[PDB]
Amino acid sequence: STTTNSNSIGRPNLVALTRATTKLIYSDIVATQRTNQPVAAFYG
């Protein structure tokens, strides 16, 4: 009367891996241009 109660198991199938991260939305919010100096200065 061998059943699944007898069988021992090696390891589970992960099936999936999830990471919980913020959707980062700033690219569409802030106009921007790289600075190539330690200081930036904008003209009005």
Binding site: S1, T2, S6, N7, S8
Partner: protein, 52 residues
């Protein structure tokens, strides 16, 4: 120990035997028979774990 002494002395002798056809043939209720199950066997499968 006592069983071995009687065995060695010939009072008790190892034996094995087959089964009458008339019993085995209907084993498990054939022809309306009853109270006659088969002997059964299986396997288990267990495990040991080693920490590194």
């Amino acid at each position: 120990a006592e069983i071995k002494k009687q065995m060695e002395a010939g009072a008790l002798v190892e034996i094995a035997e087959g089964m009458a056809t008339s019993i085995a043939e209907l084993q498990e209720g054939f022809n309306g028979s009853t109270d006659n199950p088969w002997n059964e066997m299986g396997f288990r499968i267990d495990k040991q774990v080693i920490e590194a």
